[PDB]
Amino acid sequence: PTYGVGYQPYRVVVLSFELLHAPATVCGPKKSTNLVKNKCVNFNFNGLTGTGVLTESNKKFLPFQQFGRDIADTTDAVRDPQTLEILDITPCSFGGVSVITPGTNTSNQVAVLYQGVNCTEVPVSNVFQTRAGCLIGAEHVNNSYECDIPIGAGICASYQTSQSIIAY
Amino acid sequence: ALGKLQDVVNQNAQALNTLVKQLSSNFGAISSVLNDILSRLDPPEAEVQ
Amino acid sequence: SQCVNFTTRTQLPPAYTNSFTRGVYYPDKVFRSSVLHSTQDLFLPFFSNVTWFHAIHVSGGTKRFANPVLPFNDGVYFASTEKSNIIRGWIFGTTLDSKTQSLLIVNNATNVVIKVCEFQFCNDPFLGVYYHKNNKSWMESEFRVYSSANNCTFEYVSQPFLMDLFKNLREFVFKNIDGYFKIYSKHTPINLVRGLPQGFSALEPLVDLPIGINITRFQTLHISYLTPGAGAAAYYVGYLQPRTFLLKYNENGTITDAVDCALDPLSETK
Amino acid sequence: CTLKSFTVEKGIYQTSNFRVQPTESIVRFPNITNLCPFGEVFNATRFAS
Ligand SMILES: *[C@@H]1O[C@H](CO)[C@@H](O)[C@H](O)[C@H]1NC(C)=O
Ligand SMILES: *[C@@H]1O[C@H](CO)[C@@H](O)[C@H](O)[C@H]1NC(C)=O
Ligand SMILES: *[C@@H]1O[C@H](CO)[C@@H](O)[C@H](O)[C@H]1NC(C)=O
Ligand SMILES: *[C@@H]1O[C@H](CO)[C@@H](O)[C@H](O)[C@H]1NC(C)=O
Ligand SMILES: *[C@@H]1O[C@H](CO)[C@@H](O)[C@H](O)[C@H]1NC(C)=O
Ligand SMILES: *[C@@H]1O[C@H](CO)[C@@H](O)[C@H](O)[C@H]1NC(C)=O
Ligand SMILES: *[C@@H]1O[C@H](CO)[C@@H](O)[C@H](O)[C@H]1NC(C)=O
């Protein structure tokens, strides 16, 4: 114990990494992040990458089955590798963006119809969740008139009385 | 008896299915998914596929 | 261990039967429901010739009935009909000697041991158990399979368990593809007395091992009941082929039925 | 700009496509494969010559 540091014992460990043309057996701890649901996220489950919204699912996956495919052969559901639960994957929402406009010769006020999108993913005063999509800038009216600008799903919009665009 | 209608519907669906299945064809490319090519090959190499 | 030598060696003649409509297993681990899906992979063609034999686990009586070495081809569907777990494991390889790497799978009384090594398999691999009269329970006490095992390339032992020492049908599918040895398994209670039962049951995957070796032959391993001094188990073997199958996933996702496209014109239409 | 005109008549015109991008990335893997025994080497009470 009283020798100089040069003559004192030193324990040495040498780590060598044998990398052959064979399947690897040693790896490092993967960085798994928290789970996020009901929000468009770029997910990667066990190397399966994708983009979509993860929602709690009622599908009865078998113990050994991981993914859920469909006729589209696209991953509809997954099994969270850490917590053994089933999550439905929905493609991140999208749709056409049309503009209900009375003739510019008449007015420059317009309404925007986001077709086939719920009124929750639109960043967005007036909002209408019609079966054809989310209509913005249109004032819903209970009174029914003759169709003027056919929006769809039985809803038509028109420029009328101060005047504004009314969807009925 | 409703075939005239049902038939029509099927054809529509059929076309879509075919169209959708065409997303999974290589057409000579290394892979049928753009994301894999982009993540693996650099633009100079990826652009041909 | 040290091999046990038997002066007299014999093997029963092979027998042939019909595969009927078995050998269907889940090709991948992708769930599905109420859908008819076509998959092209190595499957057991329906109504194929099945080569089957009997495994003698008791002598009564100095003749050693040794199992034969069977080719592996692209994969093997192995079924065992037995009361007690007579069939315990298999050996896979090409030369089945120390020259080339060889795989050995076994399910002893303790656990499942799977080892890929340059084994030197014994001429008559022996697994022997004796009845413990005081304990009123059989206990395995002899294991002489390989004379030596050098330069092991893989080892995996399952968790310890106790094996119990109206028949049971245990079906297995072994497929060596891309250096992966995939084992799919199914266990059912079968009331038939003889012959490969006719019916349908999908085989769930059991485990995939990246052994990455070449396999062309394999042999079965049975248990020997040592007694102070007739219902021998039976087993069947078939060879898979590249085929296209239409599998019908039901609501729960269990494959309710399958259709072999290339079996007959009707199946081709289906 | 969609119609290439300054004057737009009454009607509904498909102008654009609304798409929602991903807010963040989620990565999940099976958390434990095994656990290499490095402690048996470093924390060994006695070392070899
Ligand atoms: C790892 O996953 C298993 C699976 O259920 C879980 O029991 C365990 O708590 C997880 N470990 C950590 C550190 O999260
Ligand atoms: C605008 O429309 C009205 C009728 O709706 C018409 O009388 C008028 O001439 C139009 N204006 C122009 C500049 O064309
Ligand atoms: C939009 O989402 C809300 C809550 O997620 C839901 O109640 C509503 O029905 C959705 N819109 C449509 C048209 O279904
Ligand atoms: C339309 O009438 C319904 C009931 O008839 C009522 O609930 C709704 O608030 C009315 N909408 C408007 C904009 O007045
Ligand atoms: C199986 O092969 C044997 C001879 O190799 C033949 O006699 C028998 O008929 C075959 N099985 C069937 C079902 O044809
Ligand atoms: C085992 O490997 C070593 C070195 O890799 C080699 O020298 C030896 O010959 C191998 N064993 C046999 C039986 O060849
Ligand atoms: C699905 O599984 C549940 C629970 O295991 C069972 O109650 C139900 O009968 C099954 N249905 C089918 C069609 O197999």
Side-chain angles (χ1 to χ4, degrees):
Chain A
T2 55
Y3 289 168
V5 306
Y7 300 95
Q8 284 178 15
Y10 280 72
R11 283 178 177 193
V12 183
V13 179
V14 180
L15 300 179
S16 310
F17 304 91
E18 182 183 16
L19 181 67
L20 304 177
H21 281 64
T25 71
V26 179
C27 296
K30 299 296 183 181
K31 297 187 186 179
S32 60
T33 62
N34 185 17
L35 178 61
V36 174
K37 304 177 186 176
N38 299 267
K39 185 163 60 175
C40 174
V41 298
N42 239 332
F43 62 93
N44 182 338
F45 282 68
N46 188 27
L48 163 59
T49 53
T51 297
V53 179
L54 312 183
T55 72
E56 289 185 0
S57 71
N58 55 335
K59 290 184 174 60
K60 187 69 172 182
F61 267 64
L62 293 186
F64 66 94
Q65 290 175 337
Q66 299 294 342
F67 328 101
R69 287 185 167 182
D70 199 353
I71 306 304
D73 299 357
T74 54
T75 298
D76 183 307
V78 291
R79 174 183 294 282
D80 174 11
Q82 292 189 225
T83 60
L84 302 184
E85 60 183 358
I86 310 309
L87 303 174
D88 290 328
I89 288 162
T90 302
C92 293
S93 178
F94 74 93
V97 180
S98 316
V99 177
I100 290 74
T101 179
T104 50
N105 162 39
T106 297
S107 175
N108 287 23
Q109 187 178 12
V110 309
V112 185
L113 178 72
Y114 299 82
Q115 297 166 207
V117 321
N118 200 342
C119 292
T120 62
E121 300 296 348
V122 183
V124 65
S125 299
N126 304 272
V127 185
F128 196 172
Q129 182 61 68
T130 74
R131 284 217 168 188
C134 196
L135 189 61
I136 295 172
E139 180 180 3
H140 185 9
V141 169
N142 262 323
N143 299 333
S144 60
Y145 319 86
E146 292 186 358
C147 186
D148 199 355
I149 310 179
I151 282 171
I155 303 294
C156 299
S158 62
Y159 181 81
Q160 285 190 353
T161 59
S162 62
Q163 290 179 317
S164 62
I165 294 176
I166 58 187
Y168 55 94
Chain B
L2 282 288
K4 290 185 173 184
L5 270 41
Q6 181 61 19
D7 181 81
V8 161
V9 172
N10 297 340
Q11 292 178 346
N12 299 339
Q14 192 68 27
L16 281 184
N17 290 334
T18 298
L19 182 60
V20 168
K21 292 177 184 175
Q22 284 288 305
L23 295 180
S24 63
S25 299
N26 306 17
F27 302 103
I30 63 181
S31 178
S32 55
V33 178
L34 293 171
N35 295 328
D36 304 1
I37 301 170
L38 296 173
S39 60
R40 293 192 293 180
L41 287 176
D42 297 324
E45 305 167 343
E47 280 175 0
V48 185
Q49 312 303 349
Chain C
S1 179
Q2 184 178 7
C3 301
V4 53
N5 301 328
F6 300 90
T7 303
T8 59
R9 302 185 64 190
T10 312
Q11 53 186 355
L12 287 300
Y16 296 143
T17 319
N18 182 264
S19 70
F20 301 101
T21 65
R22 288 191 169 278
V24 172
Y25 70 99
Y26 301 82
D28 59 64
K29 292 179 177 181
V30 179
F31 176 76
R32 301 180 183 271
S33 185
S34 299
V35 54
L36 308 176
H37 177 32
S38 71
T39 58
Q40 179 182 355
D41 277 325
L42 294 176
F43 284 93
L44 177 62
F46 300 153
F47 310 93
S48 298
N49 225 334
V50 182
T51 309
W52 73 298
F53 337 76
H54 312 158
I56 300 174
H57 59 72
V58 61
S59 181
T62 59
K63 297 182 178 181
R64 178 64 175 181
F65 297 92
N67 307 330
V69 177
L70 302 176
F72 186 83
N73 296 342
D74 311 330
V76 296
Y77 165 89
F78 178 106
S80 60
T81 56
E82 70 292 23
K83 294 186 177 182
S84 61
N85 303 352
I86 301 302
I87 304 304
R88 301 300 188 84
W90 311 265
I91 54 178
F92 304 91
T94 60
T95 61
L96 305 178
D97 60 357
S98 60
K99 297 183 178 181
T100 62
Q101 290 294 349
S102 300
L103 165 63
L104 160 58
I105 297 165
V106 62
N107 183 331
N108 59 31
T110 57
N111 48 30
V112 182
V113 180
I114 305 172
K115 297 172 70 281
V116 185
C117 314
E118 301 182 0
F119 297 103
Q120 182 61 17
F121 301 104
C122 298
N123 298 91
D124 304 68
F126 178 83
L127 297 76
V129 310
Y130 76 98
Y131 184 80
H132 192 182
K133 191 176 184 62
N134 302 90
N135 189 22
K136 297 182 178 181
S137 179
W138 296 86
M139 312 187 70
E140 60 178 359
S141 60
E142 302 294 351
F143 172 85
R144 308 174 184 280
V145 176
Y146 63 94
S147 60
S148 301
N150 304 268
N151 293 22
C152 278
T153 56
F154 177 88
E155 180 177 0
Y156 165 70
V157 183
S158 66
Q159 296 297 346
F161 55 77
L162 296 176
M163 180 176 293
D164 183 6
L165 303 183
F166 180 87
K167 288 184 175 181
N168 303 272
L169 171 66
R170 298 179 174 81
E171 309 180 27
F172 310 83
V173 172
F174 308 144
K175 175 164 58 173
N176 178 19
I177 295 295
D178 305 0
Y180 266 95
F181 192 94
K182 315 186 77 65
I183 297 170
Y184 310 70
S185 64
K186 179 61 181 179
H187 190 319
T188 59
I190 190 62
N191 297 328
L192 184 59
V193 183
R194 184 180 59 83
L196 186 69
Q198 183 172 7
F200 184 78
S201 179
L203 282 58
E204 306 176 352
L206 184 60
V207 64
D208 66 325
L209 308 177
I211 62 181
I213 63 180
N214 178 16
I215 300 173
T216 57
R217 305 183 305 172
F218 85 108
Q219 183 169 3
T220 308
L221 308 178
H222 69 286
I223 196 66
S224 301
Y225 282 85
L226 301 175
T227 60
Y235 72 94
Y236 323 76
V237 177
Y239 303 103
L240 313 184
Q241 306 175 0
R243 311 279 280 202
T244 302
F245 276 55
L246 179 72
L247 315 180
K248 182 261 187 180
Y249 301 77
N250 57 12
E251 299 177 353
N252 283 23
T254 302
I255 291 170
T256 297
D257 196 329
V259 167
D260 184 4
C261 308
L263 173 58
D264 40 335
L266 178 60
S267 305
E268 296 175 337
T269 62
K270 290 178 177 176
Chain D
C1 292
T2 301
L3 282 56
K4 317 278 189 304
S5 162
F6 278 72
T7 305
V8 178
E9 308 174 1
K10 168 170 286 187
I12 184 172
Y13 307 84
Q14 163 63 23
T15 62
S16 177
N17 297 87
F18 157 80
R19 275 187 299 278
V20 70
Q21 293 177 335
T23 63
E24 54 183 339
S25 60
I26 303 302
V27 185
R28 303 220 71 185
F29 283 77
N31 82 18
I32 186 167
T33 299
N34 186 340
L35 188 147
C36 304
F38 294 111
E40 293 177 350
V41 181
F42 288 78
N43 289 337
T45 56
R46 44 187 168 185
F47 271 49
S49 297

